[PDB]
């Protein structure tokens, strides 16, 4: 069974009272797991008695030892990674004496895709906004890259926006496979790397500046690889500057090597932002 019976649950400092945690509506679908909107009370170790909205990862109906043992090993990662502004971090947990819950940061705004699809020509997204979004994610992607973690599905749907409009990257820890966000090598060799990630970021960028748009919109998946193998690259987005279109293409460089470094992107993006 699930409620720890014979497993080894060690006692942490992260653990939170199951009392104040109250589980509510689920959030989206499950490509990471069964996430639920939960309302914890006093989790900031600075605002007690002050209730807070959080997100939690309960287990599924058809769960298994693996389906558990995986979650704990994930919970362990989300502690190793550390804390960054542009990523969803471990907020707390409810391990011992009952079912395993994992508490992360909640985002009041939805996924970028649907956020960007609702702020396009009442909060009209100034290009100036568009470039901050990209910078944020990139610097988070850089952080994530530091501790050597790969992004499963780096898409706008797998990226979130707080009430503070700070872009948070989810996915660093199933369903269909996002082929259009995957690079030639990764779509052929089926092993991911940072170079493949840079590509996926390039695709993310296109997805941002197009304001929640469909990659390769029309190309059948069966021939996509062949087109990329030839050189097919997505055409410039509207209202996008050439320099930003170039950077995307640079991310989409055939040979993994000559593709831009995460740092290389972060620097370039900051310099662009200073000139807005
Ligand atoms: C595949 C379709 C679909 O609906 N996906 C999806 C994606 C995110 C959410 C979601 C949140 C989440 C999460 C999460 C899970 N595990 C992670 C992680 C982030 N960072 C690292 N680990 C290991 C989420 C949240 N934390 N707070 C508020 N809203 C959230 N949503 C909507 C849902 C569905």
UniProtKB/Swiss-Prot annotation:
Modified residues (Phosphotyrosine): 6
Cytoplasmic side: 1-276
Entry binding sites for ATP: 27-35, 57, 105-107, 111
Coiled-coil intervals: none
Annotated ranges, domain Protein kinase: 21-276
Source organism superkingdom: Eukaryota
Active site: 153 (proton acceptor)
Location(s), subcellular: Cell membrane; Golgi apparatus; Cytoplasmic vesicle
Post-translational modification remark: Autophosphorylated. Binding of FGF family members together with heparan sulfate proteoglycan or heparin promotes receptor dimerization and autophosphorylation on several tyrosine residues. Autophosphorylation occurs in trans between the two FGFR molecules present in the dimer. N-glycosylated in the endoplasmic reticulum. The N-glycan chains undergo further maturation to an Endo H-resistant form in the Golgi apparatus.
Assembly, per entry: Monomer. Homodimer after ligand binding. Interacts predominantly with FGF1 and FGF2, but can also interact with FGF3, FGF4, FGF6, FGF7, FGF8, FGF9, FGF10, FGF17, FGF18 and FGF22 (in vitro). Ligand specificity is determined by tissue-specific expression of isoforms, and differences in the third Ig-like domain are crucial for ligand specificity. Isoform 1 has high affinity for FGF1 and FGF2, but low affinity for FGF7. Isoform 3 has high affinity for FGF1 and FGF7, and has much higher affinity for FGF7 than isoform 1 (in vitro).
Family listed: Belongs to the protein kinase superfamily. Tyr protein kinase family. Fibroblast growth factor receptor subfamily.
Pathology noted in the entry: Crouzon syndrome: An autosomal dominant syndrome characterized by craniosynostosis, hypertelorism, exophthalmos and external strabismus, parrot-beaked nose, short upper lip, hypoplastic maxilla, and a relative mandibular prognathism.
Protein task: Tyrosine-protein kinase that acts as a cell-surface receptor for fibroblast growth factors and plays an essential role in the regulation of cell proliferation, differentiation, migration and apoptosis, and in the regulation of embryonic development. Required for normal embryonic patterning, trophoblast function, limb bud development, lung morphogenesis, osteogenesis and skin development. Plays an essential role in the regulation of osteoblast differentiation, proliferation and apoptosis, and is required for normal skeleton development.
UniProt note: domains: The second and third Ig-like domains directly interact with fibroblast growth factors (FGF) and heparan sulfate proteoglycans. Alternative splicing events affecting the third Ig-like domain are crucial for ligand selectivity.
Name of the protein in its database record: Fibroblast growth factor receptor 2
Gene name of the encoded protein: FGFR2
Residues of the full protein shown: 461 to 764 of 821
């Amino acid at each position: 069974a699930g409620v720890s019976e014979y497993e080894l649950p060690e006692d942490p400092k992260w653990e939170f009272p199951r009392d104040k945690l109250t589980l509510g509506k689920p959030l989206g679908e499950g490509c990471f797991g069964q996430v639920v909107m939960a309302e914890a009370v006093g989790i900031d170790k600075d605002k007690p008695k002050e209730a807070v909205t959080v997100a939690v990862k309960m287990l599924k109906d058809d769960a298994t030892e693996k389906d558990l043992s995986d979650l704990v090993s994930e919970m362990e990662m989300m502690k190793m990674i550390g804390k960054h502004k542009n990523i969803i971090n471990l907020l707390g947990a409810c391990t011992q004496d009952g079912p395993l819950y994992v508490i992360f940061e909640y985002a009041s705004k939805g996924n970028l895709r649907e956020y960007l699809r609702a702020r396009r020509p009442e909060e009209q997204m100034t290009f100036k906004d568009l470039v901050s979004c990209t910078y944020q994610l990139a610097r988070g992607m850089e952080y994530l890259a530091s501790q050597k973690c790969i992004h499963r599905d780096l898409a706008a749907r797998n990226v979130l926006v707080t009430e503070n409009n700070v872009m948070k990257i989810a996915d660093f820890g199933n369903g269909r496979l996002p082929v259009k966000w995957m690079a030639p090598e990764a779509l052929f060799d089926r092993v991911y790397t940072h170079q493949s990630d840079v590509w996926s970021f390039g695709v993310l960028m296109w997805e941002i500046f197009t304001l929640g748009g469909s990659p390769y919109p029309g190309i059948p998946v069966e021939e996509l690889f062949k087109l990329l193998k030839e050189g097919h690259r997505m055409d410039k987005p509207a209202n996008c500057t050439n320099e930003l279109y170039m950077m995307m293409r640079d991310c989409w460089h055939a040979v993994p090597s000559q593709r831009p470094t995460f740092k290389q992107l972060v620097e370039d993006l900051d310099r662009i932002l200073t000139l807005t």
